[PDB]
Protein backbone atom coordinates (compact mmCIF):
# COMPACT_ATOMS: atom_id res chain seq x y z
CA UNK A 1 0.00 0.00 0.00
CA UNK A 2 1.17 3.58 0.69
CA UNK A 3 2.65 4.84 3.97
CA UNK A 4 4.93 7.44 5.61
CA UNK A 5 7.04 9.95 3.62
CA UNK A 6 9.18 8.07 1.13
CA UNK A 7 9.95 8.59 -2.54
CA UNK A 8 7.82 6.57 -4.90
CA UNK A 9 9.83 3.76 -6.38
CA UNK A 10 9.30 1.75 -9.54
CA UNK A 11 10.42 -1.88 -9.27
CA UNK A 12 9.60 -3.88 -12.36
CA UNK A 13 9.76 -7.30 -10.62
CA UNK A 14 6.16 -8.51 -11.29
CA UNK A 15 7.33 -10.54 -14.30
CA UNK A 16 8.94 -13.88 -13.16
CA UNK A 17 12.25 -12.04 -13.05
CA UNK A 18 13.73 -14.84 -10.98
CA UNK A 19 13.68 -16.85 -14.22
CA UNK A 20 15.95 -14.59 -16.26
CA UNK A 21 18.70 -13.64 -13.79
CA UNK A 22 22.41 -13.62 -14.60
CA UNK A 23 24.92 -13.70 -11.86
CA UNK A 24 28.46 -13.39 -13.10
CA UNK A 25 30.41 -15.89 -11.08
CA UNK A 26 32.52 -16.39 -14.18
CA UNK A 27 33.98 -12.85 -14.12
CA UNK A 28 37.20 -14.51 -12.98
CA UNK A 29 37.20 -17.39 -15.44
CA UNK A 30 35.70 -15.25 -18.20
CA UNK A 31 38.85 -13.13 -17.86
CA UNK A 32 41.46 -15.82 -17.21
CA UNK A 33 39.97 -17.51 -20.26
CA UNK A 34 39.59 -14.15 -22.04
CA UNK A 35 43.35 -13.69 -21.61
CA UNK A 36 44.46 -17.18 -22.68
CA UNK A 37 42.22 -16.67 -25.72
CA UNK A 38 44.25 -13.54 -26.64
CA UNK A 39 47.61 -14.94 -25.51
CA UNK A 40 47.56 -17.80 -28.00
CA UNK A 41 46.17 -15.68 -30.82
CA UNK A 42 49.32 -13.53 -30.85
CA UNK A 43 51.22 -16.80 -30.53
CA UNK A 44 49.51 -18.24 -33.62
CA UNK A 45 49.63 -14.82 -35.28
CA UNK A 46 53.40 -14.49 -34.90
CA UNK A 47 55.06 -11.00 -34.94
CA UNK A 48 51.88 -9.24 -36.13
CA UNK A 49 50.30 -6.90 -33.46
CA UNK A 50 46.81 -8.32 -32.88
CA UNK A 51 44.92 -5.36 -34.39
CA UNK A 52 44.75 -3.02 -37.35
CA UNK A 53 46.01 0.53 -37.40
CA UNK A 54 43.03 2.69 -36.71
CA UNK A 55 42.44 6.29 -37.82
CA UNK A 56 41.88 9.51 -35.89
CA UNK A 57 38.29 10.70 -36.11
CA UNK A 58 36.46 13.62 -34.59
CA UNK A 59 33.37 11.97 -32.89
CA UNK A 60 29.85 13.45 -33.06
CA UNK A 61 27.14 15.77 -31.64
CA UNK A 62 27.51 18.83 -29.42
CA UNK A 63 28.81 16.87 -26.43
CA UNK A 64 31.70 14.64 -27.54
CA UNK A 65 32.76 16.69 -30.60
CA UNK A 66 35.38 18.40 -28.43
CA UNK A 67 37.48 15.27 -28.02
CA UNK A 68 38.88 13.09 -30.80
CA UNK A 69 38.38 9.35 -31.17
CA UNK A 70 39.70 6.33 -33.01
CA UNK A 71 37.47 5.76 -36.03
CA UNK A 72 36.64 2.55 -37.85
CA UNK A 73 39.10 2.83 -40.75
CA UNK A 74 41.16 5.20 -42.83
CA UNK A 75 38.67 5.77 -45.71
CA UNK A 76 39.67 6.07 -49.35
CA UNK A 77 41.27 9.48 -49.89
CA UNK A 78 43.85 8.93 -47.19
CA UNK A 79 44.80 5.45 -48.44
CA UNK A 80 45.94 6.63 -51.87
CA UNK A 81 47.29 9.80 -50.21
CA UNK A 82 49.40 7.39 -48.15
CA UNK A 83 50.57 5.97 -51.47
CA UNK A 84 48.94 2.54 -51.54
CA UNK A 85 45.79 0.71 -52.64
CA UNK A 86 42.83 -0.31 -50.52
CA UNK A 87 43.24 -4.02 -51.26
CA UNK A 88 46.87 -3.89 -50.13
CA UNK A 89 46.23 -1.56 -47.17
CA UNK A 90 44.33 -4.43 -45.53
CA UNK A 91 47.22 -6.86 -46.08
CA UNK A 92 49.57 -4.68 -44.14
CA UNK A 93 47.38 -4.50 -41.10
CA UNK A 94 45.45 -1.25 -41.44
CA UNK A 95 41.77 -0.37 -41.03
CA UNK A 96 40.06 0.49 -44.33
CA UNK A 97 36.59 2.01 -44.01
CA UNK A 98 34.92 2.55 -47.37
CA UNK A 99 32.23 4.81 -45.88
CA UNK A 100 33.03 7.98 -43.87
CA UNK A 101 34.21 10.46 -46.51
CA UNK A 102 36.59 13.33 -45.65
CA UNK A 103 34.96 16.71 -45.03
CA UNK A 104 37.85 18.02 -42.86
CA UNK A 105 41.46 18.75 -43.85
CA UNK A 106 43.12 19.07 -40.43
CA UNK A 107 42.02 15.49 -39.75
CA UNK A 108 42.79 14.28 -43.28
CA UNK A 109 46.32 15.65 -42.89
CA UNK A 110 46.90 14.06 -39.48
CA UNK A 111 45.48 10.76 -40.71
CA UNK A 112 47.64 10.39 -43.81
CA UNK A 113 50.54 11.44 -41.59
CA UNK A 114 49.42 8.67 -39.23
CA UNK A 115 49.65 6.25 -42.18
CA UNK A 116 53.14 6.98 -43.54
CA UNK A 117 54.36 7.33 -39.96
CA UNK A 118 52.90 3.86 -39.47
CA UNK A 119 54.51 2.61 -42.69
CA UNK A 120 57.79 3.86 -41.20
CA UNK A 121 57.89 1.95 -37.92
CA UNK A 122 56.78 -1.33 -39.54
CA UNK A 123 58.80 -4.00 -41.32
CA UNK A 124 56.90 -5.98 -43.97
CA UNK A 125 58.23 -9.47 -44.55
CA UNK A 126 58.82 -10.85 -48.08
CA UNK A 127 57.42 -13.85 -49.93
CA UNK A 128 60.07 -16.12 -48.42
CA UNK A 129 60.62 -17.35 -44.86
CA UNK A 130 64.04 -15.65 -44.62
CA UNK A 131 63.32 -12.62 -42.44
CA UNK A 132 65.04 -10.66 -39.61
CA UNK A 133 63.85 -12.73 -36.64
CA UNK A 134 60.88 -10.48 -35.78
CA UNK A 135 60.51 -9.53 -32.12
CA UNK A 136 56.73 -9.24 -31.72
CA UNK A 137 55.00 -6.09 -30.50
CA UNK A 138 51.48 -6.94 -29.34
CA UNK A 139 50.02 -3.44 -29.25
CA UNK A 140 49.54 -1.23 -32.28
CA UNK A 141 47.16 1.53 -31.24
CA UNK A 142 49.16 2.16 -28.06
CA UNK A 143 52.40 2.04 -30.09
CA UNK A 144 50.88 4.74 -32.36
CA UNK A 145 48.79 6.68 -29.82
CA UNK A 146 46.39 9.53 -30.56
CA UNK A 147 47.06 12.92 -29.05
CA UNK A 148 44.55 15.74 -28.69
CA UNK A 149 45.06 18.54 -31.27
CA UNK A 150 46.50 21.35 -29.25
CA UNK A 151 44.39 24.28 -30.49
CA UNK A 152 45.32 27.46 -28.59
CA UNK A 153 48.48 28.65 -26.79
CA UNK A 154 49.17 29.10 -23.08
CA UNK A 155 48.96 32.90 -22.83
CA UNK A 156 48.10 35.82 -25.12
CA UNK A 157 47.13 39.48 -25.06
CA UNK A 158 43.65 40.79 -24.36
CA UNK A 159 41.92 41.65 -27.64
CA UNK A 160 38.76 43.55 -26.75
CA UNK A 161 37.03 44.67 -29.92
CA UNK A 162 34.12 46.24 -28.05
CA UNK A 163 31.56 43.45 -28.52
CA UNK A 164 29.31 42.01 -25.83
CA UNK A 165 29.91 38.27 -26.23
CA UNK A 166 26.54 37.72 -24.58
CA UNK A 167 24.74 40.21 -26.84
CA UNK A 168 26.13 38.26 -29.80
CA UNK A 169 24.26 35.08 -28.84
CA UNK A 170 21.13 37.16 -28.26
CA UNK A 171 21.44 38.67 -31.75
CA UNK A 172 22.75 35.40 -33.25
CA UNK A 173 19.65 33.55 -32.00
CA UNK A 174 17.23 36.43 -32.65
CA UNK A 175 18.54 36.21 -36.22
CA UNK A 176 17.76 32.48 -36.37
CA UNK A 177 14.23 33.02 -35.07
CA UNK A 178 13.05 35.77 -37.40
CA UNK A 179 14.59 34.62 -40.69
CA UNK A 180 11.35 33.10 -41.96
CA UNK A 181 9.45 36.11 -40.61
CA UNK A 182 11.79 38.56 -42.39
CA UNK A 183 11.86 36.57 -45.63
CA UNK A 184 8.05 36.71 -45.73
CA UNK A 185 7.84 40.47 -45.14
CA UNK A 186 10.28 40.87 -48.00
CA UNK A 187 8.13 38.31 -49.84
CA UNK A 188 5.19 40.68 -49.29
CA UNK A 189 7.42 43.68 -50.05
CA UNK A 190 8.16 42.37 -53.57
CA UNK A 191 4.35 42.28 -54.04
CA UNK A 192 4.44 46.11 -53.76
CA UNK A 193 5.18 46.03 -57.53
CA UNK A 194 1.53 46.94 -58.28
Amino acid sequence: AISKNLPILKNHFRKHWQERVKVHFDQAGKKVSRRNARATRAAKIAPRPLDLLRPVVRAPTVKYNRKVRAGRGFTLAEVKAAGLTAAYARTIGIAVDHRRQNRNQEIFDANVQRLKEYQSKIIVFPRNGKAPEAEQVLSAAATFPIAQPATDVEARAVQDNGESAFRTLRLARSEKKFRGIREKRAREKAEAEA
Binding site: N65, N102, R103, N104, E106, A172, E175, K176, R179
Partner: protein, 99 residues
Protein backbone atom coordinates in the same frame (compact mmCIF):
# COMPACT_ATOMS: atom_id res chain seq x y z
CA UNK B 1 27.50 25.53 -45.49
CA UNK B 2 30.06 28.15 -44.26
CA UNK B 3 30.36 27.77 -40.49
CA UNK B 4 30.25 30.97 -38.42
CA UNK B 5 32.34 29.36 -35.65
CA UNK B 6 29.91 30.62 -33.01
CA UNK B 7 28.17 28.74 -30.19
CA UNK B 8 24.74 29.19 -31.81
CA UNK B 9 23.15 31.23 -34.56
CA UNK B 10 21.85 30.72 -38.06
CA UNK B 11 24.76 28.91 -39.71
CA UNK B 12 26.48 28.17 -36.39
CA UNK B 13 29.10 25.48 -36.05
CA UNK B 14 32.85 25.02 -35.78
CA UNK B 15 35.37 26.43 -38.25
CA UNK B 16 37.52 23.76 -39.87
CA UNK B 17 39.51 24.03 -43.10
CA UNK B 18 36.85 23.09 -45.59
CA UNK B 19 37.55 20.01 -47.70
CA UNK B 20 35.08 18.22 -49.96
CA UNK B 21 34.83 14.53 -50.86
CA UNK B 22 34.69 13.02 -54.30
CA UNK B 23 31.05 12.02 -54.96
CA UNK B 24 29.90 8.45 -54.44
CA UNK B 25 28.52 6.26 -57.22
CA UNK B 26 25.75 5.21 -54.83
CA UNK B 27 24.46 8.77 -54.58
CA UNK B 28 23.02 8.52 -58.11
CA UNK B 29 20.51 5.69 -57.94
CA UNK B 30 18.15 7.58 -60.27
CA UNK B 31 20.28 6.57 -63.25
CA UNK B 32 19.04 8.06 -66.54
CA UNK B 33 20.83 5.12 -68.15
CA UNK B 34 20.51 4.97 -71.96
CA UNK B 35 19.52 1.29 -72.12
CA UNK B 36 16.78 1.76 -69.51
CA UNK B 37 15.45 5.07 -70.85
CA UNK B 38 15.08 3.54 -74.32
CA UNK B 39 13.99 0.03 -73.24
CA UNK B 40 11.17 1.37 -71.07
CA UNK B 41 9.99 3.85 -73.72
CA UNK B 42 9.81 0.94 -76.16
CA UNK B 43 7.91 -1.29 -73.69
CA UNK B 44 5.81 1.71 -72.61
CA UNK B 45 3.75 1.63 -75.81
CA UNK B 46 3.88 -2.12 -76.49
CA UNK B 47 1.68 -2.88 -73.48
CA UNK B 48 -0.18 0.39 -73.91
CA UNK B 49 -2.00 2.25 -71.17
CA UNK B 50 -3.49 0.52 -68.12
CA UNK B 51 -7.15 0.75 -67.04
CA UNK B 52 -6.48 3.52 -64.53
CA UNK B 53 -3.95 5.36 -66.70
CA UNK B 54 -6.61 5.36 -69.44
CA UNK B 55 -9.50 6.87 -67.47
CA UNK B 56 -6.91 9.13 -65.86
CA UNK B 57 -6.26 10.86 -69.18
CA UNK B 58 -10.00 10.81 -69.97
CA UNK B 59 -10.30 12.97 -66.86
CA UNK B 60 -7.64 15.45 -67.96
CA UNK B 61 -8.87 16.10 -71.51
CA UNK B 62 -12.37 16.26 -70.06
CA UNK B 63 -13.53 18.46 -67.18
CA UNK B 64 -10.71 19.32 -64.77
CA UNK B 65 -7.02 18.67 -64.30
CA UNK B 66 -6.90 19.33 -60.57
CA UNK B 67 -9.93 17.01 -60.78
CA UNK B 68 -7.64 14.36 -62.31
CA UNK B 69 -5.10 14.92 -59.52
CA UNK B 70 -7.73 13.88 -56.96
CA UNK B 71 -8.08 10.45 -58.58
CA UNK B 72 -4.33 10.44 -59.20
CA UNK B 73 -3.55 10.86 -55.50
CA UNK B 74 -6.16 8.25 -54.59
CA UNK B 75 -5.27 5.61 -57.18
CA UNK B 76 -1.48 5.68 -56.84
CA UNK B 77 -1.74 6.49 -53.12
CA UNK B 78 0.34 9.66 -52.68
CA UNK B 79 0.37 13.32 -53.68
CA UNK B 80 3.82 14.08 -55.10
CA UNK B 81 3.94 10.52 -56.48
CA UNK B 82 0.70 11.27 -58.33
CA UNK B 83 1.86 14.31 -60.33
CA UNK B 84 4.69 12.24 -61.83
CA UNK B 85 1.96 10.04 -63.30
CA UNK B 86 -0.29 13.02 -64.09
CA UNK B 87 2.38 14.99 -65.96
CA UNK B 88 3.42 11.73 -67.63
CA UNK B 89 -0.07 11.60 -69.14
CA UNK B 90 0.43 15.07 -70.60
CA UNK B 91 3.47 13.55 -72.31
CA UNK B 92 1.44 10.64 -73.65
CA UNK B 93 -1.19 13.16 -74.80
CA UNK B 94 1.49 14.48 -77.18
CA UNK B 95 1.63 11.06 -78.87
CA UNK B 96 -1.41 12.26 -80.86
CA UNK B 97 -2.10 15.84 -81.89
CA UNK B 98 1.13 17.90 -81.96
CA UNK B 99 3.73 15.17 -82.90
Amino acid sequence: TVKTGIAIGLNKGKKVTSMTPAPKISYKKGAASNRTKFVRSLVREIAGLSPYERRLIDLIRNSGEKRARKVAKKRLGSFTRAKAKVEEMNNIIAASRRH
